Scaffold this motif. Structure first.
Motif, mmCIF file in Angstrom:
data_model
loop_
_atom_site.group_PDB
_atom_site.id
_atom_site.type_symbol
_atom_site.label_atom_id
_atom_site.label_comp_id
_atom_site.label_asym_id
_atom_site.label_seq_id
_atom_site.Cartn_x
_atom_site.Cartn_y
_atom_site.Cartn_z
ATOM 1 N N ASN A 59 0.892 -1.172 0.000
ATOM 2 C CA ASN A 59 0.000 0.000 0.000
ATOM 3 C C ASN A 59 0.921 1.211 0.000
ATOM 4 O O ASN A 59 1.629 1.424 0.979
ATOM 5 N N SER A 63 -2.469 3.542 -4.177
ATOM 6 C CA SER A 63 -3.052 2.341 -4.696
ATOM 7 C C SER A 63 -2.406 1.221 -3.884
ATOM 8 O O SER A 63 -1.671 1.452 -2.898
ATOM 9 N N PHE A 64 -2.715 -0.003 -4.271
ATOM 10 C CA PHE A 64 -1.881 -1.136 -3.865
ATOM 11 C C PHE A 64 -1.198 -1.715 -5.097
ATOM 12 O O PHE A 64 -1.755 -1.705 -6.192
ATOM 13 N N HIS A 92 -1.256 -2.649 -10.496
ATOM 14 C CA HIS A 92 -1.990 -1.953 -9.446
ATOM 15 C C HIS A 92 -3.366 -1.650 -9.983
ATOM 16 O O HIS A 92 -3.625 -1.903 -11.152
ATOM 17 N N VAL A 157 -5.599 -11.728 -4.156
ATOM 18 C CA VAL A 157 -5.308 -10.305 -3.946
ATOM 19 C C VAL A 157 -6.225 -9.750 -2.871
ATOM 20 O O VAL A 157 -5.778 -9.146 -1.888
ATOM 21 N N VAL A 158 -7.519 -9.976 -3.083
ATOM 22 C CA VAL A 158 -8.560 -9.506 -2.164
ATOM 23 C C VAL A 158 -8.217 -9.888 -0.713
ATOM 24 O O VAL A 158 -8.227 -9.058 0.190
ATOM 25 N N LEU A 161 -5.444 -7.943 1.371
ATOM 26 C CA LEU A 161 -5.542 -6.491 1.570
ATOM 27 C C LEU A 161 -5.682 -6.111 3.034
ATOM 28 O O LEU A 161 -5.245 -5.033 3.427
ATOM 29 N N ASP A 162 -6.271 -6.988 3.838
ATOM 30 C CA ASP A 162 -6.347 -6.750 5.275
ATOM 31 C C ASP A 162 -5.020 -6.538 5.939
ATOM 32 O O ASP A 162 -4.971 -5.915 6.983
ATOM 33 N N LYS A 165 -3.445 -2.519 5.166
ATOM 34 C CA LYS A 165 -4.515 -1.538 5.252
ATOM 35 C C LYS A 165 -4.049 -0.094 5.034
ATOM 36 O O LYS A 165 -4.722 0.689 4.363
ATOM 37 N N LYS A 222 -13.757 -4.904 -0.724
ATOM 38 C CA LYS A 222 -12.522 -5.058 0.015
ATOM 39 C C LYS A 222 -11.464 -4.039 -0.440
ATOM 40 O O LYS A 222 -10.691 -3.573 0.373
ATOM 41 N N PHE A 223 -11.418 -3.701 -1.728
ATOM 42 C CA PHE A 223 -10.546 -2.603 -2.180
ATOM 43 C C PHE A 223 -10.843 -1.349 -1.371
ATOM 44 O O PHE A 223 -9.943 -0.605 -1.014
ATOM 45 N N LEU A 226 -9.246 -0.308 2.137
ATOM 46 C CA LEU A 226 -7.911 0.220 2.247
ATOM 47 C C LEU A 226 -7.925 1.676 2.660
ATOM 48 O O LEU A 226 -8.939 2.355 2.544
#
Ligand SMILES: NS(=O)(=O)CCNC(=O)/C(Cc1ccc(O)c(Br)c1)=N/O
Ligand SMILES: NS(=O)(=O)CCNC(=O)/C(Cc1ccc(O)c(Br)c1)=N/O
Ligand code: NA
Ligand SMILES: [Zn+2]
Length: 258
Positions: A59, A63-64, A92, A157-158, A161-162, A165, A222-223, A226
């Motif tokens: 992150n 973006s990631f 990304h 990917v999803v 993401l946790d 953050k 989930k995106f 972030l």
């Protein structure tokens, strides 16, 4: 610099630090499907991702990003409008606060929920830094996301993401296969453009696939969890991290398909 996507530091402000923002070859653009012309001279497009080596996911506050080992020709883009070999270095996304916005490119003014950018550099320039400064230095494969059925190849990917953050967080992201992010068809539009983020270098050949990928509501939600901010800063959700369409000026968009 202190660029971002909000009222006070977003796309309308970027030109003060990066005057090329008002240049002749800026991205993204609206793709007018009726003005784009089929180009029989385009060679077949070759997306050769079998040997991709993903490394980490980060992150960066904008973006990631998933980076790849681009120390050899593993995962490469060739053909279409491109001369020579372009090496995949990272991907990304850009996305919205709502399912009806989030893409950077638009198609007949239609905005998609998100847009994936697979970023590649021309190996004739030896490294990605040097390539970023050449008019044919970079190629970005752009893929639209529309909300519908889940994309299995996005789920890994999803699910990470946790763990990233907030700005500055990274995690391991080895053994990810970016082929799982592609649609069935490689039909595309192409035009000469730029990075869509500062420094906005006019050094990108854009290849934008016509067929979107379908992702689920739950995946795109989930995106949107972030954060733009760093840890133990106040929460500002990372949403609407897209630049709007820029003037086409005297450019032609070519279609690979009839
Ligand atoms: N494997 S990686 O470390 O993620 C690779 C990082 N480099 C790249 O993405 C690029 C394109 C680029 C991205 C942002 C910029 O501001 C500029 Br300029 C160039 N190289 O040209
Ligand atoms: N949007 S783009 O034209 O495909 C290529 C330019 N943008 C990007 O690579 C990214 C990820 C990123 C942002 C800042 C960086 O320093 C690096 Br490294 C990578 N945007 O968030
Ligand atoms: Na699809
Ligand atoms: Zn991008």
């Amino acid at each position: 610099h202190h660029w971002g996507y909000g009222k006070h530091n977003g796309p309308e402000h970027w030109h003060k630090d990066f005057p090329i923002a008002k240049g002749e070859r800026q991205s993204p653009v609206d793709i007018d499907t009726h003005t784009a012309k089929y180009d029989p001279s385009l060679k077949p497009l070759s997306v050769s991702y079998d040997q991709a080596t993903s490394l980490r996911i980060l992150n960066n506050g904008h973006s990631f990003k998933v980076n790849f080992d681009d120390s050899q020709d593993k995962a490469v883009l060739k053909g279409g409008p491109l001369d020579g070999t372009y090496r995949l270095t990272q991907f990304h996304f850009h996305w919205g606060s709502l399912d009806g916005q989030g893409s950077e490119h638009t198609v007949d003014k239609k905005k998609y929920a998100a847009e994936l950018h697979l970023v590649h550099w021309n190996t004739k320039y030896g490294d990605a830094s040097k390539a970023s400064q050449q008019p044919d230095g970079l190629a970005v494969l752009g893929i639209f996301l529309k909300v519908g059925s889940a994309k299995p190849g996005l789920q890994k990917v999803v699910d990470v993401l946790d763990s990233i953050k907030t700005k500055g967080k990274s995690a391991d992201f080895t053994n990810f296969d970016p082929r799982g992010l592609l649609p069935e068809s490689l039909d595309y539009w192409t035009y000469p453009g730029s990075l869509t983020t500062p420094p906005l270098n006019e050094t990108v050949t854009w290849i934008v696939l016509k067929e979107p990928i379908s992702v689920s509501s739950e995946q795109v939600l989930k995106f949107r969890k972030l954060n733009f901010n760093g840890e133990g800063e106040p929460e500002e959700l990372m949403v609407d991290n897209w630049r709007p369409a820029q003037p086409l000026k005297n450019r032609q968009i070519k279609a690979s398909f009839k």
